[PDB]
Design a protein around this ligand. Structure first.
Ligand SMILES: OC[C@H]1O[C@@H](O[C@H]2[C@H](O)[C@@H](O)[C@H](O[C@H]3[C@H](O)[C@@H](O)[C@H](O)O[C@@H]3CO)O[C@@H]2CO)[C@H](O)[C@@H](O)[C@@H]1O
Ligand SMILES: [Cl-]
Ligand SMILES: [Cu+2]
Length: 235
């Protein structure tokens, strides 16, 4: 159970984005139905009044929280991966539009899941803004909690992989468009009951064997991190 509070751009806090530049759902409950329209941008997908200006090459940091800013972030039980996707905003997230910019699942070096490191990072994970066409975009940050993912939601709707999905409205101003955005995958649709990484038993199956759901990270993607960029306590 987690939500996005706002974003930072090059370590500068853009301020509380909830219902402002984040298409915030009404609460932190997960999405679990893989064929739900709610898989696009969570249960209240609509245009919000602001879009955060960035340029290609900026560091864009998403900041998550549980109940209040810079708290426990997400229950520690919620082990799983983190991904970020991008789509042109005019699509409203519909159709074959989502391109993956970031994946972090289980780090064998550190023996930690992305969610574990997100807690340590005070809810902060970042991407480099890619060199796509200037314009308005949706950045879809997705945490998958796997603690009940041994079951398919379609078999037992009390369980299943849990999707904490947050769409941020980002406007890319200065970009050379050296890597034009291609078509991508649909949400709902990209993840199905047979997709690797959706049904996974963290109690019985080693995390060293976990394969995150496709698609693969796009060749145009410039990278990211799971790390505290900004100190909310200084404000
Ligand atoms: O026993 C089932 C699993 O529970 C997990 O805890 C979640 C609770 O099930 C859920 O009821 C609770 O929801 C809270 C939410 O955290 C809070 O922010 C909101 O204000 O109210 C909700 C209740 O209406 O969330 C927790 C997760 O934080 C355990 O984490 C898990 O190990 C356990 O299997
Ligand atoms: Cl939960
Ligand atoms: Cu939860």
């Amino acid at each position: 159970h987690t939500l996005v509070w706002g974003v930072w751009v090059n370590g500068v806090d853009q301020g509380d984005g909830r219902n402002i530049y984040i298409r915030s759902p009404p609460n932190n409950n997960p999405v679990k139905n893989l064929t739900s329209p709610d898989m696009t941008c969570n249960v209240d997908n609509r245009v919000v009044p602001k879009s955060v200006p960035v340029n290609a090459g900026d560091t864009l940091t998403f900041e998550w929280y549980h109940n209040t800013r810079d708290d426990d972030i997400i229950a520690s039980s919620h082990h799983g991966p983190i991904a970020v996707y991008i789509a042109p905003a005019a699509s409203n997230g519909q159709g074959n539009v989502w391109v993956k910019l970031f994946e972090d699942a289980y780090n064998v070096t550190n023996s930690t899941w992305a969610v574990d490191r997100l807690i340590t990072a005070h809810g902060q994970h970042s991407v480099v803004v890619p060199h796509v066409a200037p314009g308005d975009y949706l950045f879809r940050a997705e945490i998958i909690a796997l603690h009940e993912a041994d079951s398919l939601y379609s078999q037992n709707p009390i369980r299943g992989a849990q999707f904490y999905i947050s769409c941020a409205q980002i406007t890319i101003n200065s970009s050379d468009d050296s890597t034009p955005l291609p078509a991508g995958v649909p949400f709902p649709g990209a993840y199905t009951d047979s997709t690797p990484g959706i049904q996974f038993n963290i109690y019985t199956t080693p995390a060293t064997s976990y394969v995150a759901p496709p698609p693969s990270v796009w060749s145009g993607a410039l990278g990211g991190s799971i790390a505290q960029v900004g100190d909310a306590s200084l404000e």
